[PDB]
Amino acid sequence: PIVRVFLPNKQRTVVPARCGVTVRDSLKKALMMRGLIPECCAVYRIQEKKPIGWDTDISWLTGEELHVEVLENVPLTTHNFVRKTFFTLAFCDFCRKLLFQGFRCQTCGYKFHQRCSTEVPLMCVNRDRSSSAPNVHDWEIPDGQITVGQRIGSGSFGTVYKGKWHGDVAVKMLNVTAPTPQQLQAFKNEVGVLRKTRHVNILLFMGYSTKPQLAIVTQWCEGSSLYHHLHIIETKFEMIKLIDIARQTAQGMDYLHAKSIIHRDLKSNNIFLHEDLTVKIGDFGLATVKSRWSGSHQFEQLSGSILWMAPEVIRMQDKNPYSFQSDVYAFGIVLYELMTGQLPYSNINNRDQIIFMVGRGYLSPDLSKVRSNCPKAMKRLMAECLKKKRDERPLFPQILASIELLARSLPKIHRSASEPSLNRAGF
Amino acid sequence: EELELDEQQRKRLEAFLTQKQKVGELKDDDFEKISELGAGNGGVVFKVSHKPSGLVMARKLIHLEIKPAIRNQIIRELQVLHECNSPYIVGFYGAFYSDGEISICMEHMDGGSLDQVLKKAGRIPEQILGKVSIAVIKGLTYLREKHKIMHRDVKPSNILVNSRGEIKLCDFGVSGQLIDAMANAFVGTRSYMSPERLQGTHYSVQSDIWSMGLSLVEMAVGRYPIPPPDAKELELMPMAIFELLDYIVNEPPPKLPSGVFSLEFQDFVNKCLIKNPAERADLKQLMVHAFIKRSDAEEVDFAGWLCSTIGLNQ
Amino acid sequence: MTEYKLVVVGAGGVGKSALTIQLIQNHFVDEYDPTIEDSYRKQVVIDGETCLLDILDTAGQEEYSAMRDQYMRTGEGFLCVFAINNTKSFEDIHHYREQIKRVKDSEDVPMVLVGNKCDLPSRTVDTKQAQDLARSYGIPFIETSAKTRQGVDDAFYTLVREIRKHK
Amino acid sequence: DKEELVQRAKLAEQAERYDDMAAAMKEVTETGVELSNEERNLLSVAYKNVVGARRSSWRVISSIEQKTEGSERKQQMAKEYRVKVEKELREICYDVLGLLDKHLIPKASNPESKVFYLKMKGDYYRYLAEVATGETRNSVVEDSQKAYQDAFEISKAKMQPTHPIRLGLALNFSVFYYEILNSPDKACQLAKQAFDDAIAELDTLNEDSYKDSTLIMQLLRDNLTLWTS
Amino acid sequence: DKEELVQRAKLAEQAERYDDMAAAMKEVTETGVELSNEERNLLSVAYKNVVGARRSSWRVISSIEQKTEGSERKQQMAKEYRVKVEKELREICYDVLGLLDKHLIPKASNPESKVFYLKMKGDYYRYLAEVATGETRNSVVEDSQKAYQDAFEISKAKMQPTHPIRLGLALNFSVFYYEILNSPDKACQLAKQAFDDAIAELDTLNEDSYKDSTLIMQLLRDNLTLWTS
Numbered sequence A: 001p002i003v004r005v006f007l008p009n010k011q012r013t014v015v016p017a018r019c020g021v022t023v024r025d026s027l028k029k030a031l032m033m034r035g036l037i038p039e040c041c042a043v044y045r046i047q048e049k050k051p052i053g054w055d056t057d058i059s060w061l062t063g064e065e066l067h068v069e070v071l072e073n074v075p076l077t078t079h080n081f082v083r084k085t086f087f088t089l090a091f092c093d094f095c096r097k098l099l100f101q102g103f104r105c106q107t108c109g110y111k112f113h114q115r116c117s118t119e120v121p122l123m124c125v126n127r128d129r130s131s132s133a134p135n136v137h138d139w140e141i142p143d144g145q146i147t148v149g150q151r152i153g154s155g156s157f158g159t160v161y162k163g164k165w166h167g168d169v170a171v172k173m174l175n176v177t178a179p180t181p182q183q184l185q186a187f188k189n190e191v192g193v194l195r196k197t198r199h200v201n202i203l204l205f206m207g208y209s210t211k212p213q214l215a216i217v218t219q220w221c222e223g224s225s226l227y228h229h230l231h232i233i234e235t236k237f238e239m240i241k242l243i244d245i246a247r248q249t250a251q252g253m254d255y256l257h258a259k260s261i262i263h264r265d266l267k268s269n270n271i272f273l274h275e276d277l278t279v280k281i282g283d284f285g286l287a288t289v290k291s292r293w294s295g296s297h298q299f300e301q302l303s304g305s306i307l308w309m310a311p312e313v314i315r316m317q318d319k320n321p322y323s324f325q326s327d328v329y330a331f332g333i334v335l336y337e338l339m340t341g342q343l344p345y346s347n348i349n350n351r352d353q354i355i356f357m358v359g360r361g362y363l364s365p366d367l368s369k370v371r372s373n374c375p376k377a378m379k380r381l382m383a384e385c386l387k388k389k390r391d392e393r394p395l396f397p398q399i400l401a402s403i404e405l406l407a408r409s410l411p412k413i414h415r416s417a418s419e420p421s422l423n424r425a426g427f
Numbered sequence B: 001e002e003l004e005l006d007e008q009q010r011k012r013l014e015a016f017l018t019q020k021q022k023v024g025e026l027k028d029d030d031f032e033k034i035s036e037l038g039a040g041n042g043g044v045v046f047k048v049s050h051k052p053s054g055l056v057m058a059r060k061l062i063h064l065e066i067k068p069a070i071r072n073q074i075i076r077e078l079q080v081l082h083e084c085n086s087p088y089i090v091g092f093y094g095a096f097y098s099d100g101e102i103s104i105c106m107e108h109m110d111g112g113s114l115d116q117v118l119k120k121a122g123r124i125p126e127q128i129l130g131k132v133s134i135a136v137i138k139g140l141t142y143l144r145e146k147h148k149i150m151h152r153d154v155k156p157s158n159i160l161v162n163s164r165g166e167i168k169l170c171d172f173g174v175s176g177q178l179i180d181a182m183a184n185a186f187v188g189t190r191s192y193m194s195p196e197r198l199q200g201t202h203y204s205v206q207s208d209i210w211s212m213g214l215s216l217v218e219m220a221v222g223r224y225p226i227p228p229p230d231a232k233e234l235e236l237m238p239m240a241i242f243e244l245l246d247y248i249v250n251e252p253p254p255k256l257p258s259g260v261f262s263l264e265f266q267d268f269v270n271k272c273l274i275k276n277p278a279e280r281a282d283l284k285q286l287m288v289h290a291f292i293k294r295s296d297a298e299e300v301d302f303a304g305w306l307c308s309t310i311g312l313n314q
Numbered sequence C: 001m002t003e004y005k006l007v008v009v010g011a012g013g014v015g016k017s018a019l020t021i022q023l024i025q026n027h028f029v030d031e032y033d034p035t036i037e038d039s040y041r042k043q044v045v046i047d048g049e050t051c052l053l054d055i056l057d058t059a060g061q062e063e064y065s066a067m068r069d070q071y072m073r074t075g076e077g078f079l080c081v082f083a084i085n086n087t088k089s090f091e092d093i094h095h096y097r098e099q100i101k102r103v104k105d106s107e108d109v110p111m112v113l114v115g116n117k118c119d120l121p122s123r124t125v126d127t128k129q130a131q132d133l134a135r136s137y138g139i140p141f142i143e144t145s146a147k148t149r150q151g152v153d154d155a156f157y158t159l160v161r162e163i164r165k166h167k
Numbered sequence D, E: 001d002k003e004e005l006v007q008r009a010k011l012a013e014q015a016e017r018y019d020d021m022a023a024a025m026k027e028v029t030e031t032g033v034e035l036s037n038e039e040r041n042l043l044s045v046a047y048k049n050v051v052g053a054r055r056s057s058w059r060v061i062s063s064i065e066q067k068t069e070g071s072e073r074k075q076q077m078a079k080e081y082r083v084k085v086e087k088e089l090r091e092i093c094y095d096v097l098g099l100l101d102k103h104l105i106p107k108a109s110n111p112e113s114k115v116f117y118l119k120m121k122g123d124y125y126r127y128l129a130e131v132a133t134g135e136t137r138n139s140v141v142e143d144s145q146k147a148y149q150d151a152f153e154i155s156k157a158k159m160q161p162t163h164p165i166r167l168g169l170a171l172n173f174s175v176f177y178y179e180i181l182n183s184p185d186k187a188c189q190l191a192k193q194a195f196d197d198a199i200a201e202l203d204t205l206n207e208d209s210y211k212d213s214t215l216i217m218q219l220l221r222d223n224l225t226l227w228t229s
């Protein structure tokens, strides 16, 4: 008289069917061997699955097949909550609105409103008053003026030639050969959108030309890319310098989103470190030259690199996968690259496998390779930026604000922790 | 010898070795580009000639920004090719680094890759296909014995031929560091990796066998087998990449249509496309396959047929 | 990350289950509860790699060899266990190796020879016999005691290393 | 030299010591010289911090008072604490109003500074009223009405429908309406009109003020959505 | 009477207003009535809030002091402000220290209360030494070491090593060693020993003492991780 038992984690065992012996006593040894306890698990019999008591005699179950499923009764969990009110710009992590009076975790810095308490994640993973007024603190250059420069490199959709037009200018030779009239019109519209733009941290857009094939003319930049300094010379950066770079990079993304233009291609190659101090970004927008047209349509064709692509843009089940969340995810990968100094997925050499495992959600960037001097708040920010779902990702105003807060909080957090406070919360 | 090489193959190998002995150091200024042979996924191939010797060779340039240490490591790893000598491998001359570019000097092949031949021919006769498979198996065996290296990138684009009918392989993964470097370069349209290797489990040449079988099927049908032809698509005798990968992982593999292909060939491709890599036969078991025996028994004037199909005058 | 399927085989009573339970839970079972089938999972770092071990502990009683054969077919490497006080269990290592060859349809299967119960007095299978048998198959020999835990990790970790070599 | 006081207040800002900052800026106000655009922000923020802290204290005390509903003198003690903090808040607001009406209102060369000062006056009257109860509440409500009307007229006349000051003034006026007059219809109408005006010039967003304007607009949308009920 | 003071202190803590609560607890302990652990926890938290805020302010001010050197004589007035802040800190520190000798240390009825008071004395000695210099700092740190050793000996001889209070005492002692003796080796060894002792005594505590231990152990792991380099 024996009973065959199926166990979680695709395991199994057989126990004898002795009279006077319960199922719980029979399987206690197996559960202890497998780090489980009967009280936190359920037992079912095949008859399709019928739950039975743990105290049931195994003798009456002779010849039967049993299955064990783990229960869930005590999530428990907690954070160290201290009441506090922020006098600068801040937002609830859950409710995404302005935050004047609420609660704060001393552990990780999670902030939420009084009314948002029941929605806070359980695991410390590392008639109301209205709001108020918070504190305050046709442009084609004619031919004969473009100096055909020297070939430099070829990217996802273009080629680089540094020419002369009233000084050094950057010219990108597009890989598109035959633009459709509708495609040409849309290209002109987007160029006109870009022309009336100007910012300290965005490269100037300087028109275009169409006589010598079709190419884009932009302001040339001196120096080198971020990707070079992170992985060519392997020059390390200090916390102040690194967070400053991140803050500057985020500064321009808010501007671009304010003018309602999706970057779609923020990879570490596309960030310049001009004059060794100022972050400048180029090579953005241009929806026309990507997703090669089959006619009067531009059905989405994937192109470029895959490390900085978000899961949804890979999945391609959405009509307009390139949304603000794509730029958010790109910024997350950029933060990770700056913080670790190692490219993501450094243990997989098959790009097909990388694509597949990103698409099914099975693989995410490492979170243990971070250094041991980065404050936990930046880790929380980085973790939040890389969420699989696109709905819960933050938008760039919030990330800019949190970066600003953690930056101004820098001088006091360098030293080690001291004595922590007690619970000081009511639940 | 020490191998099963006839007089012709041995003599041609000796001649190529003698030609290599006439080639010394390689530099950028030592070669002049004659024509472009095609652009790769992250590079391009140019027909070049070594002016100090006048020999016309094939040169592939790879653009990948890496640190000098990795460059020198790849240079050291590339030196193994000198001891590699087999009729089934594209001849090489050498490689060097210059101008932030990776250049490799290899034997120029006038026959071109199988992709252009298939494009200009539509479909390939089974007799022609059978001859290539045995040479592929022998080359894979040579690589696995002499160097224990799995190609991992077996596809029609990596097979070159000549007007003489000889078949050789290339683009093998000899340098693992270079393999890792090219991993994060750009994106492709269609792939051929085995479903198990997508799961992080290594089974060496089983994936190569699986990829070879699918490549042979595609060359036989004149269409990418994924997705399988539907009704009128099969009667003719823009899918997303993620869709293709998921379909490959979670669908039964396709098969040759009945009647138009010999049952031995259908059994061979079924064995070569077993979903379980463990159940898939190895090179030894595939060698003793009845279809392979028939192919060996058969004799085909492949060189003349290829010249006629391309249009070359003998 | 890396999963290894390990099968423990050998004659009844040699200590297959006691060895497995020492690996999984660091506890020695002194009772003799004959196995019909038992499988376990254990995550362990071996040579710097985080390994998921599936341990398939089989019946020594030949009455249940059909179940044993189903476990063997899924396995990647085999611990072939005898007891140092049971000469027939030692002689029957040949039987178990032949079973592995039959079920795996291969003569090239990772295997480690384990001589268990080395804490006992009056040992009757000597070191020279055991090392000669392991040598005859080209496999490692590990002495173990499930009671003292001597050799337990070495036996399983060596098998993992043999599987890696074979891959 | 007032610049020394300016630097002192700037240091105190990051020092998070707001009482000393308030006193230092009050000294500069007492100097009786016309202020710059920059210093006005510091003054407003400095007083706003203290007023907001006191407001939060009053809110939590009132919430506790509504919560207890017992029979004990703890409620009386809490009410005494509430009246004490209300008294000190009244003193602070009176000081701010006096300084404003004696130095800033009399000397307003540029209309924008006048609009800002009137907005401050109205918001501080609202701060008074939210604890005020009785005839004095009605009087300060009327004074806030006058200030808001005066500011709104000049804003509609000589201020773009995109500049942040006008947006904040509209927000404050809407809040004052919704809280004091409890007239959601007109407040919603004003909010919709202001949002439409802002959307009209959705392009004219220069480097100087891009995030603040859109942040205010988002807050307006949120309040309108909340008021839809 | 005293219960009314307790309610007042709880209300103040809820409203985050601290100085009034500090004075209330000071008079509560000056009354000389029996003091329980729950009551003194409120006093400790109250003093901790203000002292930590002012410590942060001093740290920021000192950072700004050395932020710029080749400039005008504004660093001079900045350091004058810093000295004023330091004097303010010294006054409250002296009051706190004298409070122990007045009521806490003499009215010592239970060993864990003595451990708690000595730990507080050492912590505030370290706080003073943060700004103290020279012979005064040396004397203060010697006094801190004396209290540290006395508290640790009693903790070792009397109660279990798995209680959170002992863990906090060890952590603070290690931090003091790092910040004064600057001996990473001795402090690291002591921290590792304490962590191992805590790990040995696991799964043997009460329902209430299941969360404090987690935070303390996490902090210990963080300190060891940072100090390993």
Ligand SMILES: Nc1nc2c(ncn2[C@@H]2O[C@H](COP(=O)(O)OP(=O)(O)NP(=O)(O)O)[C@@H](O)[C@H]2O)c(=O)[nH]1
Pocket (backbone or CB within 6 Å): C010, C011, C012, C013, C014, C015, C016, C017, C018, C019, C029, C030, C031, C032, C033, C034, C035, C036, C058, C059, C060, C061, C116, C117, C118, C119, C120, C144, C145, C146, C147, C148
């Ligand atoms: N002294 C000693 N006894 C051991 C050792 N290993 C196992 N035993 C004892 O030998 C008996 C059989 O052990 P067990 O692990 O059940 O053997 P098994 O090979 O799994 N038997 P089966 O094939 O029936 O499943 C038990 O009484 C066990 O305590 C050992 O190393 N030393």
Ligand SMILES: Nc1ncnc2c1ncn2[C@@H]1O[C@H](COP(=O)(O)OP(=O)(O)OP(O)(O)=S)[C@@H](O)[C@H]1O
Pocket (backbone or CB within 6 Å): A152, A153, A154, A155, A156, A157, A158, A160, A170, A203, A218, A219, A220, A221, A222, A225, A265, A267, A269, A270, A282, A283, A304, A305
């Ligand atoms: N404004 C610029 N000034 C200087 N160099 C530039 C400028 N824009 C592009 N480049 C160079 O262009 C090279 C390759 O072209 P890019 O398209 O910028 O790179 P890329 O990232 O491969 O292309 P994409 O579309 O961004 S993926 C880079 O390595 C830069 O050195």
Ligand SMILES: Nc1ncnc2c1ncn2[C@@H]1O[C@H](COP(=O)(O)OP(=O)(O)OP(O)(O)=S)[C@@H](O)[C@H]1O
Pocket (backbone or CB within 6 Å): B037, B038, B039, B040, B041, B044, B045, B058, B090, B106, B107, B108, B109, B110, B112, B113, B116, B155, B157, B158, B160, B170, B171
């Ligand atoms: N040995 C060769 N002899 C003659 N032509 C060759 C040879 N190798 C490559 N070519 C040609 O050059 C082109 C570019 O080389 P490839 O590296 O094969 O490009 P590719 O096919 O895009 O790269 P993959 O990785 O194989 S898809 C090929 O498509 C052929 O037309």
Ligand SMILES: O=C(NOCCO)c1ccc2cncn2c1Nc1ccc(I)cc1F
Pocket (backbone or CB within 6 Å): B039, B040, B041, B042, B043, B060, B089, B090, B091, B092, B104, B106, B169, B170, B171, B172, B173, B174, B175, B176, B178, B179
């Ligand atoms: O060429 C390659 N991939 O294709 C490029 C995209 O078309 C390739 C790919 C991997 C690799 C590892 N070590 C060398 N490797 C290559 N080089 C190579 C190998 C053999 C010959 I013979 C000539 C060669 F250039």
Ligand SMILES: [Mg+2]
Pocket (backbone or CB within 6 Å): B040, B041, B157, B158, B171
């Ligand atoms: Mg190729």
Ligand SMILES: [Mg+2]
Pocket (backbone or CB within 6 Å): C016, C017, C018, C033, C034, C035, C057, C058, C059, C060
């Ligand atoms: Mg057993």
Ligand SMILES: [Zn+2]
Pocket (backbone or CB within 6 Å): A078, A079, A080, A105, A106, A107, A108, A109, A110, A124, A125
């Ligand atoms: Zn938390």
Ligand SMILES: [Zn+2]
Pocket (backbone or CB within 6 Å): A092, A093, A094, A095, A096, A097, A112, A113, A116
């Ligand atoms: Zn919220």
